[PDB]
């Protein structure tokens, strides 16, 4: 029962993060869109993953 409930609780976020990782690999190296508000520079390493 503990394993089942832990897996059920885990499957609410972990699939999303795994899909995000898979997308990051699959779609690495692009510039998809320009956010219409001036985000801070310190957020660069994570917004522009895969961009040199």
């Amino acid at each position: 029962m503990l394993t089942d409930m832990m897996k059920g609780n885990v499957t609410n976020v972990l699939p999303m993060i795994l899909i995000g990782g898979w997308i990051n690999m699959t779609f690495s190296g692009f510039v998809t869109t320009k956010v219409p508000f001036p985000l801070t520079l310190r957020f660069k390493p994570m917004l522009q993953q895969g961009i040199e």
């Binding site: 001036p38 801070t40 520079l41 310190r42 957020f43």
Partner: protein, 61 residues
């Protein structure tokens, strides 16, 4: 927690607790730098300056 009028004051205490967290947030910013307070974060806002003096020419033709 509205047993008496002190709830209002209690609410302020609750707010104070929230304020404490907010204070920690400032520390968190100081610990992370994820706040646009320095000039560096304003770098992208700087338009290139216009040229005021034009100078051309070069080696003798």
């Amino acid at each position: 927690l509205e047993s008496s009028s002190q709830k209002f004051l209690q609410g302020l205490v609750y707010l104070i607790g929230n304020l404490m967290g907010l204070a920690l947030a400032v520390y968190k910013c100081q610990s992370m730098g994820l706040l646009p307070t320095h000039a560096s974060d304003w770098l992208a806002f700087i338009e290139p300056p216009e040229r005021m003096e034009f100078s051309g020419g070069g080696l003798l033709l």
